[PDB]
Amino acid sequence: GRATKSIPPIAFPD
């Protein structure tokens, strides 16, 4: 469910 504070935001499985 993790997401990077970037664009495009990378979404992780957690």
UniProtKB/Swiss-Prot annotation:
Cross-link type Cyclopeptide (Gly-Asp), residue numbers: 1-14
Q: Show the disulfide pairing.
A: 3-11
**Which residues are listed under the site Reactive bond?**
5-6
Reading the lineage from the top rank, the first entry is Eukaryota
Which modifications occur after translation, per UniProt? This is a cyclic peptide.
Q: Which residues form a coiled coil?
A: none
Function as written in the Swiss-Prot or TrEMBL entry? Inhibits trypsin, cathepsin G, elastase, chymotrypsin and thrombin. Does not inhibit factor Xa.
Q: What is this protein called?
A: Trypsin inhibitor 1
Parent-protein residues present = 40 to 53 of 56
